């Protein structure tokens, strides 16, 4: 109850890959400050999921209920749980 997870999060090319984790810090900054951030992969290839942990339960349990599906304007929405 102190962490968040997202789904349908593919990688992107250069000049934008940074934005992927950067925008995470900006969007989640209104609820508090993120302390833990992990971006796993499959055989060194394109991921689809990430793992973020907050310094408090009230940040995670809030963020999940505030950022439920990001609007990246691509194809399919995300699922923050």
């Amino acid at each position: 109850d102190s962490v968040i997870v997202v789904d349908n999060v593919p990688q992107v090319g250069p000049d934008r890959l940074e934005k992927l984790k950067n925008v995470i810090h900006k969007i989640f900054s209104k609820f508090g400050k993120i302390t833990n951030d992990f971006y796993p992969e499959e055989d060194g290839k394109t991921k689809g999921y990430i793992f973020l942990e907050y310094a408090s339960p009230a940040h995670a349990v809030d963020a999940v209920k505030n950022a439920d599906g990001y609007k990246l304007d691509k194809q399919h929405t995300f699922r923050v749980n």
């Binding site: 934005k19 950067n22 925008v23 900006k26 969007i27 950022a67 990001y70 609007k71 990246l72 304007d73």
Partner: peptide, 11 residues
């Protein structure tokens, strides 16, 4: 990331 629309959080 910058001063633009929050196109990363569906209300």
């Amino acid at each position: 990331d910058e001063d633009v629309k929050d196109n990363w959080d569906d209300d």
